[PDB]
Structure 1
Amino acid sequence: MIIPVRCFSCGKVVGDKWDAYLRLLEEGKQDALDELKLKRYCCRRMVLTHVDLIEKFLRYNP
């Protein structure tokens, strides 16, 4: 259901960071968050917990 712009908790942006993350996994085989600059758990949990449904929604036709 898409990535959440900015973290609820503190506010730091986080929209861009989605692809960077989902990438540093598939390839660089990796911590990811830490380098993506996601320090304190508030924003941490943001990314590390997103379940991107939009993908499946997108699998629908018209």
Structure 2
Amino acid sequence: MIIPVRCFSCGKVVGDKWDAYLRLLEEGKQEGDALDELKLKRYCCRRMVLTHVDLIEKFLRYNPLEK
């Protein structure tokens, strides 16, 4: 739904690296190189950013219920 704050397995904070990851991918870097540049060594952390699906961008497209 939205990038988790902590890696499930170990507990490293990965919630502050989603925007940087998208910026790096925008510049043409490969996914492995982008994850390496963010200093994500353990594959337990790498799966958190690699396999995250961002669904909040789909929930936000609905008109807000209040105003």
Q: Give TM-score scaled by structure 2 length.
A: 0.86
Residue 62 of structure 2 aligns to a residue whose secondary structure is coil
Deviation at 1:29, TM superposition (A): 3.7
What 5-or-longer segments of structure 2 have no aligned partner?
Answer: none
**Could you list the runs of 5+ residues in structure 1 that have no partner in the other structure?**
none
Q: Aligned-residue CA RMSD in angstroms? A: 1.0
Deviations 1:4-53 (A, max 9, x none): 00100010001110000011011254410011011010000000000000
Percent of pairs with identical residues: 100
Question: What TM-score results when the alignment is normalised by the length of structure 1?
Answer: 0.92
Distance in 1, matches of 2:58 and 2:12, equals 27
- Number of residue pairs aligned between Structure 1 and Structure 2: 62
Partner of 1:51: 53
After the TM superposition, list the runs of 4 or more consecutive aligned residues in structure 1 that deviate by more than 3 angstroms: none
Q: Which has the larger radius of gyration?
A: 2
